Amino acid sequence: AQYEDGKQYTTLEKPVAGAPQVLEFFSFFCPHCYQFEEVLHISDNVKKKLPEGVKMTKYHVNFMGGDLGKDLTQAWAVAMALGVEDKVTVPLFEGVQKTQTIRSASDIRDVFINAGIKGEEYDAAWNSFVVKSLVAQQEKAAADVQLRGVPAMFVNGKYQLNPQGMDTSNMDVFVQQYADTVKYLSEK
């Protein structure tokens, strides 16, 4: 058939109860994640085709970058808590990977301050238990899908996107196939 298990997607041996409908994992340290987000715009292209009533969730991971990687997971929790993901995603990626001006937790905070988030507001969120629970949620979700690497995307806690079974061709044909595959899985 057109879409096949083992080709555009794989199936989790162990389905995740109560998982987000569309769940993406990434790291701001991850070079392919930079490509996915800043060049391919995978997240955005996926959203443009999702059925009505289907939400996308995106989580950061700890396993790249040591202490800073964990700082970035905590900052991503802050971004989610404050609802400013679309203000900090580009400057965090560029700060870590393009300019390499993000080397500490303070440098991360600077991105938020420069994006217009008040210092008090960031610090309050950073130290909050709501953010601690959001960090834990991200770590638990990684465990639940038995995550090995990023970028990664899972649909209804049952299916894993398999980009290596798509074409690399026109980056654009790749992106279209990826987005179309998520939509197909959403309706499965």
Side-chain angles (χ1 to χ4, degrees):
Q2 291 291 350
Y3 298 96
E4 285 180 352
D5 201 323
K7 182 172 49 178
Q8 301 94 339
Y9 70 93
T10 55
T11 303
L12 290 181
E13 33 219 354
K14 262 170 149 66
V16 184
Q21 288 160 308
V22 181
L23 176 61
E24 182 180 358
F25 291 92
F26 77 109
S27 174
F28 285 111
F29 277 102
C30 159
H32 290 160
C33 303
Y34 188 105
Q35 294 298 318
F36 258 43
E37 180 60 24
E38 302 298 305
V39 180
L40 298 176
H41 308 283
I42 289 287
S43 291
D44 283 352
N45 272 274
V46 175
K47 295 323 117 176
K48 286 169 28 210
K49 291 177 170 177
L50 287 179
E52 209 171 41
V54 182
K55 73 168 318 187
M56 179 147 209
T57 306
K58 177 148 62 172
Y59 291 159
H60 195 266
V61 304
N62 296 333
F63 59 81
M64 305 182 68
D67 273 296
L68 197 50
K70 274 206 91 175
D71 280 323
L72 286 158
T73 300
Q74 186 159 349
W76 189 247
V78 169
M80 291 189 284
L82 297 178
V84 295
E85 303 99 317
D86 306 329
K87 298 187 170 168
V88 299
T89 292
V90 168
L92 292 169
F93 263 124
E94 300 199 336
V96 176
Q97 292 192 48
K98 180 190 191 178
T99 63
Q100 291 182 359
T101 47
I102 295 178
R103 314 170 199 102
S104 70
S106 183
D107 300 331
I108 298 173
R109 181 176 181 279
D110 289 343
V111 168
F112 285 71
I113 299 311
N114 188 68
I117 291 82
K118 289 180 187 163
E120 30 288 318
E121 177 179 18
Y122 182 92
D123 294 341
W126 176 271
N127 294 297
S128 76
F129 283 94
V130 157
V131 158
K132 286 179 211 299
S133 46
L134 277 171
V135 172
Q137 288 184 25
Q138 294 175 86
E139 295 166 343
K140 181 189 171 270
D144 285 345
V145 299
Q146 308 196 39
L147 191 70
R148 276 164 166 101
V150 286
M153 195 174 301
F154 300 81
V155 175
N156 295 312
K158 198 31 167 302
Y159 307 106
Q160 186 174 340
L161 277 286
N162 193 38
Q164 53 176 31
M166 309 173 183
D167 186 357
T168 87
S169 151
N170 181 44
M171 332 154 75
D172 291 315
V173 176
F174 170 76
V175 170
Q176 287 300 310
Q177 184 166 26
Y178 196 109
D180 286 342
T181 300
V182 177
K183 182 173 194 296
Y184 158 85
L185 289 177
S186 191
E187 298 160 349
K188 198 170 167 86

